[PDB]
Every structure is written in C-alpha cells, then in structure tokens.
Amino acid sequence: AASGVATNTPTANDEEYITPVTIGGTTLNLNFDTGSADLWVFSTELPASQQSGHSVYNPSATGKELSGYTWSISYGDGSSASGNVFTDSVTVGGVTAHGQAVQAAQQISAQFQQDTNNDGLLGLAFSSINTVQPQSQTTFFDTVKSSLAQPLFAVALKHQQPGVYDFGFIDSSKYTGSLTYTGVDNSQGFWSFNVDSYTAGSQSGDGFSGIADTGTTLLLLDDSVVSQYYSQVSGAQQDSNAGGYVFDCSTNLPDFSVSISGYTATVPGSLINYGPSGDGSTCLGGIQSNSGIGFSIFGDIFLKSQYVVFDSDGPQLGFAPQA
Amino acid sequence: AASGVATNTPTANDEEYITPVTIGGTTLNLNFDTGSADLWVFSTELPASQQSGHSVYNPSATGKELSGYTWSISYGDGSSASGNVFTDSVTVGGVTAHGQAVQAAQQISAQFQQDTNNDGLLGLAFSSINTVQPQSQTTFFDTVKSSLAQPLFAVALKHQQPGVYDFGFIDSSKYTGSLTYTGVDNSQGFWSFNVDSYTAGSQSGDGFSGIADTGTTLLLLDDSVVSQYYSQVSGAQQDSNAGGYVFDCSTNLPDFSVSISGYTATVPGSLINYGPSGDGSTCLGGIQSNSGIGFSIFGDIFLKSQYVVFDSDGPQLGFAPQA
Ligand SMILES: COC(=O)[C@H](Cc1ccccc1)OP(=O)([O-])[C@H](Cc1ccc2ccccc2c1)NC(=O)[C@@H](NC=O)C(C)C
Ligand SMILES: COC(=O)[C@H](Cc1ccccc1)OP(=O)([O-])[C@H](Cc1ccc2ccccc2c1)NC(=O)[C@@H](NC=O)C(C)C
Ligand SMILES: *[C@H]1O[C@H](CO)[C@@H](O)[C@H](O)[C@@H]1O
Ligand SMILES: *[C@H]1O[C@H](CO)[C@@H](O)[C@H](O)[C@@H]1O
Ligand SMILES: *[C@H]1O[C@H](CO)[C@@H](O)[C@H](O)[C@@H]1O
Ligand SMILES: *[C@H]1O[C@H](CO)[C@@H](O)[C@H](O)[C@@H]1O
C-alpha cells in the first residue's frame, strides 16, 4: 500500500503554501487547495511573457491530450484561469498518480500573472466540482485514494516554518492528544463542517458552517462576527489599501475559538496578527469578512493552529492542536 | 398542479430554436439547451455596444443579488460567458419559478456577440453541472419540478415550423404510437442514453452512448461512423469553410437510425440535408464529427424526427416518431 509525505513551505507572511509536484518528470511548485478540485499548471501554451519566473509544464513532451476537453475556473477573489487538458504522471511525496488529468493553462488573470511564487494549483476538494468539460476529472487524491493505506490526507501548516501534507496515514507526532472527528457535508463539493458555537475574546455566539480551505490565506467570517471581534481591538479600523481591518502591530489580540463536536479549536491571538499591512506601520488582521456569502472560510490563519485530517470515509474531518 | 406549453421557433436553417421567457416582467428570447445547466441572459452589465439588437435583463429593477456569487461557462464549440448572479421570477409557458437564479452576463465571447437571434440560454441538463460559485443553483426545471403535475418536460422541434416544450405533461397528439423509454445515466449531468446499434444507409454497426442535446444544431458522431455515412454520398467532401462534409443539394441521402431499447429511431435522409453550406452551391450535412470526445451528441437534426420525453423519475428518456 502507498503513503507519502510532501513538505510545504509558506511564502512571505504565510500568504500561501507551496509544495513540489513532479509532472511528466518536471517539478513545479504548486499551491495545494482543499477549496477547489482542479489541478492546473502554468504551461508552454501561455504567452512566453507569462511563463517568465515560473517552472512550466510542456504537454507535448509527455502528456496525452484529451481532444475536445477544456477547463475554466473562477475563484472567490475573482481570479480565473482556463485551458486544455492532458493526462500524465503526477508524483507528490513519492505517491504517483498515473493518467492524472493535468489542466494546462492557456489564459490566466492578473492575480496569477503577478504571483511568481507558484506554478499552479493542486485541488483537493471533492471531484464533483472539478471544472473539466465535457466530462469532469478526478483530483489527485481521488485518483490515488484506492492505492493508499488509508483513504485520507492530513495537513499541518505552520507559521514561518516548513509543514507537511501526509498522504494515506496519520502522523500522531504532529498533534497533542487525540483527534476529534466531525461529519462533513460534501454536497457542494467542499470539506464543509458545522461548529456549535464560537468565542471571540469576551463575546460568545451561535454556531454556523464553514469550509476547511488551505487555499485561502485568512479566516473569513460573517460581518457580525468580524465586528464583534474588532470591537475588542483598540484602534482597529478598516483600510481598503490593506484589505480589511488593521491595527497597531503591538496590540494584544483576543483569541478566537470554535466548538466542533465537543472539541474547542482555539486560534491564539498571536496567530491572528497576519503581518505588516503593507500600509505603512499597521498590521493586517487574520480575521476578515466573508462578503456575505453565508458560510465561513477556515483558511490558513485557522489551520496554522491545528493538525487536520481529511478522511474520505464518512466523509469526516479530524482535528487536534498542533504539536 | 402546474403544467404549461412554451412555443419554440427555429431560426434560419433551424440553426437554433428560441422560446420566450419572462424574467422580472421583461421577455427575452432564449435558446433552451438540454446540454447545459445554466440560465444566463444578456444584461445591462454588458458594454452598451454588446447590448445592441437584444432584449436585456436589468438586474437592478427586480433581481435580488447573491453577493459574492459568480458563474463562468465554456461550451463545446469553445464559446464562453461569465458574470454575476441574481434571483428573480422566471416564467416559461405560464409556469413561474419564483427565486430562480438568473445568471447576468458581464462578458461573452465572439460567438454570442455575433448571434442576435437569442438573448441567452436556459439550461435543462441536470443541476449537478450548474456553474454558479461558490454554491451551484438549480435549473428552471429543477426549481419548478415539485409543483408540476408530472416531473418531466417533453419537446418537439420541427423543421421550419413552430414546435413546443411541454412542461409537466405529455401531449400524445405530438407523436405516433406509444413511447418507448430507456434509462438515463446522469453521472456527468447530461441526459445520456445508450443505443444498441445503428444503421447508416447500407451499413450497420455496434452501439455507443450519447446525449440528448437541444443546444447543438447537428448530429455529432464518431469519425468512423461519419466516414461510413459519407462514403455512401456521391461527391461528399469536407469543406472547412462550411464546417464539415458538404454535397450537392440534390443528392439522395441515406437514412440514419439507431436502436434504443428495442425502438428504432429513424432520421430520414431528407432531414440530414441541413441547408446551403453558405459555401456557394453545396449543402451542409446534418451528420458531422464529434471531434473524438468519446460519445455522440444527439442534436437538433436527430430531435426533429422524434417527440422526446425528459423524465426526472428514473431518470429516463421516452421516444416516439413525431406526428
Ligand atoms: C470556488 O471556491 C473557491 O474559489 C475556493 C473557496 C472559496 C469560496 C468562496 C470564497 C472564498 C473561498 O477558494 P480557494 O480555492 O481556496 C481560492 C484559491 C486561490 C485563488 C486565487 C489565487 C491567486 C493567487 C495565488 C493563489 C490563489 C488561490 N482562494 C481564494 O479565492 C481567496 N484568495 C486568497 O486568500 C479569496 C477568498 C480571498
Ligand atoms: C459543456 O457541454 C456543452 O457545451 C454542451 C454539450 C456538448 C459537449 C461537448 C460537445 C458538444 C456539446 O453543448 P450545448 O450546451 O448544447 C452548446 C450550447 C451553445 C454553445 C454556443 C452557442 C453559440 C451561439 C448560439 C447558441 C449556442 C449554444 N452547443 C455547442 O457547444 C455546439 N454549438 C452548436 O451546435 C458545439 C458542439 C457544436
Ligand atoms: C506510509 O505508509 C505506507 C504504508 O504503511 C508505508 O509503506 C510508507 O513507508 C509510509 O510509512
Ligand atoms: C519535506 O521536508 C520535510 C522537512 O523539511 C520532511 O519532514 C518531509 O519528509 C519532506 O522531505
Ligand atoms: C397542464 O396540466 C395541468 C395539470 O393537469 C393543467 O392544469 C394545465 O391546464 C395543463 O393542461
Ligand atoms: C406557442 O404557440 C403555439 C402555436 O404557434 C401554441 O401551440 C402554444 O400553445 C404556444 O402558445
């Protein structure tokens, strides 16, 4: 049976986490994203100017083209990408998926043209939301799932330190205590789960649902919760230049926690200080608005505090504090 | 209980079929498409130059915006469209869906900018393939399905004559004999079905699967079948200006038929003559290649010969020769 460990590394301010992935013999640095189901990469089909500062996949060398197939994806921040499709060998942490569908980019929006830290995204949400037309493809995980020792993957994202993606096994040395599991609603293709309640510093409130999403940097919550949280931060104010609420970097931030099937997941205030706002001398808050979409996004700010197991059996998510 | 009848009308050469749909009090002419799951319309959000020669939806007047929601779709011919989302009242043939998600176009590719015959598309494939992010919406049919007398719709597309879309009931006067049903595989979101065999003129061959797709003008089949068919047409030759095989307009074309759960669906040779190729004095064939995608597209050329029932119970498709 198979299993493997892929090491991830955060970019400046933990804005994103990259992990090497070898496709058809070429190694690219991809952003693993549990919030989407497409594996797409910068390729030789892009204009040469857009290939600069990236490792690119050349489909002609090793891929098998799916004639007539296309893909087109649009993300939460409005970014987008589209292209054609090939199958090829894809290796991650020593685990190889043969015949994996690789989505070669032909067009990418400005956000991606500006980000030279990654060469594409590897989706780990459920395959039901893969965008390939006319017939959707399976994610790397769904492709290899049956070959793994256990049909799950786990992740430990860290603050300014390398972390890991464990495929097909759980590394108990990565967390304290035992794991607590909760049921996943995969109906919209996400690793969605419910929280029973939350505590923002001195204020507690009713539960809500949200998605475990490695692809989003911040912890995005309803406007009412964000207000409650920042009302407790002296001098907090919104700064559109920075992207949300900002505050003096030395401010003492309250903790934030959620109750999940009896387990209290706590994000300490120190992790809620994302980093310099870029806006002179303030810091950007790790908690920001979800724009009224009706569910919360448990992004990297939250994930940095926990070891999280994504188990296809159930499905269900397991949580424990990182070691 | 509800039911209704919407009249469709073919454009020149039966290239597409339009049907009026009233959204928030404004009537638009839409192309009903059983091959996709999005209801999208030309809107006031498009550049004014692109609104010309169309009836447009103004979301601000009656729609409720789903903040943070987007849609982006890519079709078989490579065309595409994208925009934002609103809920509104949508009436088709006297049947009203309240709170139906209407996808307002913000960008559309050249194919749509050139086609002034329609103001958008109304998808009737399964809702599982609807493109709305972050949470997909239901098609008009799935929205109203529970209110209908029977959870089905039926269609009779005609050659140069008005036809109908029957919602929630079957009009037995539209076909000869009794209906034959066959099981539908909705796993890729299409009204997919299997045929046991086919007969192209003097040649017969093994079965294959395909989708019932009102949104595609032609009958698209595997290259091997297309070759077999045209090898029997004197003087047939490909003409890229025209889009495929063309032949002298007076040529006697062989029939084409498929066996489906014991029923023989026959497309007479006269319907296989699509119309002038635009390429001087030849006619375009109604049968053309599917580009190697692995399944056939039973488009309008085929549908013009049958009354077809799309039944959500099963699901299953019913067929009988048009009356
Ligand atoms: C269709 O669902 C998505 O796009 C999922 C889920 C989702 C849905 C709605 C709102 C937020 C997130 O996001 P993702 O796949 O993790 C998606 C992945 C993504 C998108 C653009 C990128 C641009 C450059 C580099 C990495 C990128 C990663 N991240 C984001 O869109 C967010 N960006 C950052 O936090 C916005 C929320 C702030
Ligand atoms: C994602 O699936 C589709 O796009 C489905 C199914 C499909 C898949 C693969 C190949 C062909 C068809 O096609 P549709 O929704 O019926 C799709 C609907 C469609 C697309 C563009 C249009 C542009 C102008 C006006 C009407 C349009 C209708 N039609 C077509 O793309 C075809 N166009 C014509 O036959 C190409 C095949 C010739
Ligand atoms: C992950 O687990 C597999 C299956 O037990 C091992 O073979 C591998 O070495 C790694 O420990
Ligand atoms: C990535 O690198 C980490 C340490 O930097 C290892 O723990 C892991 O096995 C992988 O090689
Ligand atoms: C369609 O069927 C409904 C339900 O029987 C009728 O009320 C309607 O008039 C139409 O015949
Ligand atoms: C559309 O028009 C047809 C005839 O043109 C009617 O049969 C149908 O009821 C609808 O009014």
Swiss-Prot record, chains A, B:
Residues 17-320 form the Peptidase A1 domain. It catalyses: Hydrolysis of proteins with broad specificity similar to that of pepsin A, preferring hydrophobic residues at P1 and P1', but also cleaving 20-Gly-|-Glu-21 in the B chain of insulin. Clots milk, and activates trypsinogen. Keywords: Aspartyl protease, Disulfide bond, Glycoprotein, Hydrolase, Protease, Secreted. Disulfide bonds join 249-283. The keyword Secreted applies. CDD domains: Aspergillopepsin_like. Glycans are attached at residues 3, 7. GO terms for cellular component: extracellular region. The active site is at 33, 213. GO terms for molecular function: aspartic-type endopeptidase activity. Its EC number is 3.4.23.20. GO terms for biological process: proteolysis. It is found in: Secreted. PROSITE patterns: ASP_PROTEASE (PS00141), PEPTIDASE_A1 (PS51767). It is an enzyme of class 3 (hydrolase). Monomer. Secreted aspartic endopeptidase that allows assimilation of proteinaceous substrates. The scissile peptide bond is attacked by a nucleophilic water molecule activated by two aspartic residues in the active site. Shows a broad primary substrate specificity. Favors hydrophobic residues at the P1 and P1' positions, but can also activate trypsinogen and hydrolyze the B chain of insulin between positions 'Gly-20' and 'Glu-21'. Belongs to the peptidase A1 family. This is Penicillopepsin-1. It comes from Penicillium janthinellum.
